[PDB]
Write a structure and sequence with these properties.
Blueprint (H helix, E strand, L loop, with lengths): L3 E12 L11 E9 L6 E10 L17 E12 L4 E15 L9 E18 L2 E11 L4 E12 L1
Antiparallel strand pairs: 1-2, 1-8, 2-3, 3-4, 4-5, 5-6, 6-7, 7-8
Length: 156
């Protein structure tokens, strides 16, 4: 196969809420995979996932929590700008999953569909050091979602 690069970073999605957490930022991880690095052209895929997890505390306002997970996947073309920098765009869709805890002969689950788009760039200050910066945003009529990713990887 062609040359591939592995990069990892932290992923957080800012969401509007009544007062959950301070920055309303959930904890998640983003794994990036690049196929056909070549030089003239290439492609890049972005994967991210997160889950609510706040320590129990008595505020009197209860905790929304929700015990749910959010997944999103995007992909797009990559074009080198100079001799060590490239610009690429991410396009796809975001999905959310939720499960209710109860005892029944069957289980119940619901899914949601949202648009996913964003942009990212690759910067290599050193041959063996690459910094990846990508972000994603979903457009909902009532819910506004802001997501950013920060990490680094190595070229293989």
């Amino acid at each position: 196969e062609g040359e591939s690069s592995i990069s990892i970073g932290y992923a957080q999605s800012r969401v509007k809420e009544d007062g959950y957490k301070l920055d309303k930022n959930p904890r998640g991880f983003n794994l990036k995979y690049r196929y056909e690095f070549n030089n003239d052209w290439g492609v890049i895929g972005s994967f991210a996932q997160t889950r609510r997890g706040f320590e129990e505390s008595v505020d009197g306002f209860k905790l929304i929590d929700g015990d749910f997970k959010y997944y999103s996947v995007t992909a797009g073309p990559v074009f080198r700008i100079n001799e060590y920098v490239s610009l690429y765009g991410l396009l796809g869709a975001g999905h959310g999953k939720a499960k209710f805890s109860s005892i029944f002969g069957q289980s119940e689950s619901r899914s949601k569909t949202s648009l996913a788009y964003g942009a990212g760039l690759q910067f290599n200050p050193h041959p063996n050091f690459v910094i990846d910066a990508s972000y994603e945003y979903s457009k909902l009529d009532d819910v506004k979602v802001g997501t950013w990713m920060l990490g680094a990887g190595y070229r293989f």
